[PDB]
Nucleic acid binder design. Structure first.
Ligand SMILES: OC[C@H]1O[C@@](CO)(O[C@H]2O[C@H](CO)[C@@H](O)[C@H](O)[C@H]2O)[C@@H](O)[C@@H]1O
Ligand SMILES: [Mg+2]
Length: 581
DNA sequence: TGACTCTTTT
DNA sequence: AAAGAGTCAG
């Protein structure tokens, strides 16, 4: 392939500082926090340019251009560059188009994760995949300057050529505003959150780990006694031999590889031998120790004593965020021993507090809205306990006739409706038969005929159109909706049902984040957004701001969109994330 | 290195 | 429904 033409500049010139350009600020490290920038490419009306970062980032004019909002840039994964630049004390402004976010909105199923993959969607192939240039795994490395510069320039040239086709298709999809007014402003907001980080009380985590280590050694030794020998408890294969061969415990569930030792299998095995509950206890403690004490500690920055997560804004099929290093969206809450981990997440400044606000049943409320189910809407308009009310309806009983087991099962039905699990999935969850599960679902549709109507209609719409959409026009293609394989087709149907629910909830929280950031600034508060956990926002703020935030945050969240039923937000604050409960 | 298995969250 | 730790082939 002949090299694409470009100037390998030694110095920044005026013609590199046009008010419209494709810009590449290359951070090759997967985790971009305080990570090197290996090179820079600019493409504009005047030409193609490669700049060495030590030159560019020391040039007052270039830096000024980077921070000038009126100088428009087109990029791929602008958040990566923005954050890497934040660590160097440089502001990136004026990013008017992000090809990563554009490709993501166009079809999240494509898994677009480099410029090449995005370009391929429009039959543009004059750019290499990053993996071919940098290698992968242990072989991963930055190549020599000629190879590096050409690659960065080809990526920039691709972005420059692809902006128009991508924007055009977004417009046809009615997704132009979704990109420009939602995902892109959110991206700046996430960059600030990641950069700010969350303070961690490492000392408390460490002493927790010490306590766990003691309890782990105790249970582990007890396990060896009950087995009559030592083995690797964390090896499902070895444990399977102890349980199902040495101890002759029944085999209720198997895997592709051998015996299942899932927690739900073990729970059923407990009455047979004393070893089982000890194994369950071991795995609980071991999960906390390895994943949440040791894992968290590994990624706390020693300089700051903070964790700086990375939100992947371009991954999920539903439009949710995910987060990594650490993942702050699965910190334990359910069981008290796990929940205590949240005590280690503290405010980053003295006399500040953690403030958390969460939507109450936002997914079921969205469902009531999109389905226009009279019963479901009435229930939310009365702010009823939705699980108790669902139990009342399914079992045809009065509120005081609802037993705890009845409510538990109604709750599992709702969870099934919300996440679109199979009737086989409901059966598994409630430990009942499919016939019984199917009866539950059938009773539900009798009490909520509008939801049944919605399930039917959306599946048909997915068939006819080839995709489903959310409130704010996020899209998900479902080509498997026509499949002749039952399991493949059924999963697609469930995704047709679930996506406008989970996706629209994602849309709403994302808008609330944008609305909140603007309100905080207007109100001149020092409060800052730290985390989003699917349906909740977590902030830290001076204690003197708590009373104002108690009024402000739920109002912004509740008013983010207007639905046929109210949105409800609960809130708490305290000296640690644990206490904000 | 990657397929597997298991566990945590919403 | 949909990140990461550990094990065990290759
Ligand atoms: O920068 C986040 C952004 O990068 C992508 C690849 O383009 O993911 C990379 O970065 C993530 C966080 O460090 C990694 O988890 C991921 O494995 C890595 O490829 C995008 O998927 C993401 O939106
Ligand atoms: Mg909640």
């Amino acid at each position: 392939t002949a090299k694409m033409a470009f100037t390998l500049a030694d110095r920044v010139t005026e013609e590199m500082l046009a008010d419209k350009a494709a810009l590449v600020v290359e951070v090759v490290e997967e985790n971009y926090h305080d990570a090197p920038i290996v090179g820079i490419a600019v493409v504009n009306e005047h030409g193609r340019f490669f700049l060495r970062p030590e030159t560019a980032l020391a040039d007052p004019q270039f830096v000024a251009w980077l921070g000038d909002e009126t100088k428009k840039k087109s990029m791929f994964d602008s958040k990566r560059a923005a954050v890497a630049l934040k660590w160097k004390g440089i502001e990136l402004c004026g990013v008017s188009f992000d090809l990563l976010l554009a490709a993501y909105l166009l079809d999240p199923a494509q898994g677009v994760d480099d410029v090449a993959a995005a370009a391929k969607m429009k039959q543009y192939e004059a750019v290499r995949p990053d993996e071919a240039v940098y290698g992968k795994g242990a072989k991963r490395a930055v190549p020599d300057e000629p190879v590096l510069a050409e690659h960065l320039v080809r990526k920039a040239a691709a972005i420059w050529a692809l902006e128009r086709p991508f924007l055009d298709e977004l417009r046809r999809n009615e997704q132009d505003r979704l990109l420009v007014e939602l995902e892109q402003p959110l991206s700046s907001i996430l960059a600030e959150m990641e950069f700010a980080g969350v303070k961690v009380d490492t000392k408390r985590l460490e002493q927790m780990g010490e306590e766990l280590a003691e309890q782990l050694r105790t249970v582990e030794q007890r396990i060896y006694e009950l087995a009559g020998q030592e083995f690797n408890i964390n090896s499902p294969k070895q444990l399977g031999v102890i349980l199902f061969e040495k101890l002759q415990l029944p085999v209720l569930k198997k895997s592709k590889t051998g015996y299942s030792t899932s927690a739900d299998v073990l729970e059923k095995l407990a009455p047979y031998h004393e070893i089982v509950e000890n194994i369950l206890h071991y795995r609980q403690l071991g999960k906390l120790q390895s994943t949440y004490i040791e894992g968290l500690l590994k990624v706390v920055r020693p300089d700051t004593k903070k964790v700086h997560t990375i939100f992947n804004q371009a991954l999920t099929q539903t439009g949710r965020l995910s987060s990594t290093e650490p993942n702050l969206q699965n910190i334990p809450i359910r069981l008290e021993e796990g929940r205590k981990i949240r005590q280690a997440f503290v405010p980053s400044e003295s006399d500040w507090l953690i403030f958390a606000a969460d939507y109450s049943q936002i997914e079921l409320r969205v469902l009531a809205h999109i389905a226009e189910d009279d019963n479901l809407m009435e229930a939310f308009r009365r702010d009823l306990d939705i699980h108790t009310k669902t139990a009342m309806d399914i079992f045809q009983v009065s509120e005081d006739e609802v037993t705890p087991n009845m409510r538990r099962q109604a709750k599992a039905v709702n969870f099934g409706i919300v996440y679109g699990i199979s009737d086989y999935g409901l059966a598994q969850n409630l430990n009942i038969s499919r016939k019984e599960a199917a009866e539950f679902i059938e009773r539900y549709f009798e009490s909520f005929p509008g939801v049944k109507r919605y399930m039917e209609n959306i599946v048909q719409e997915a068939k006819q159109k080839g995709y489903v959409t959310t409130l704010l026009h996020r899209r998900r293609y479902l080509p498997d909706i026509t499949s002749r394989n039952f399991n493949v087709r059924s999963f697609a149907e469930r995704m047709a049902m679930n996506t406008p629910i989970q996706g629209s909830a994602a849309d709403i929280i994302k808008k609330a984040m944008i609305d909140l950031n603007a309100r905080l600034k207007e109100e001149r508060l020092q409060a800052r957004l730290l985390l989003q956990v699917h349906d909740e926002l977590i902030l830290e703020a001076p204690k003197e701001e708590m009373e104002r935030l108690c009024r402000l945050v739920p109002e912004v969240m509740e008013q983010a969109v207007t639905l046929r039923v109210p949105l409800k937000v609960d809130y708490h604050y305290g000296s640690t994330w644990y206490d904000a409960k």
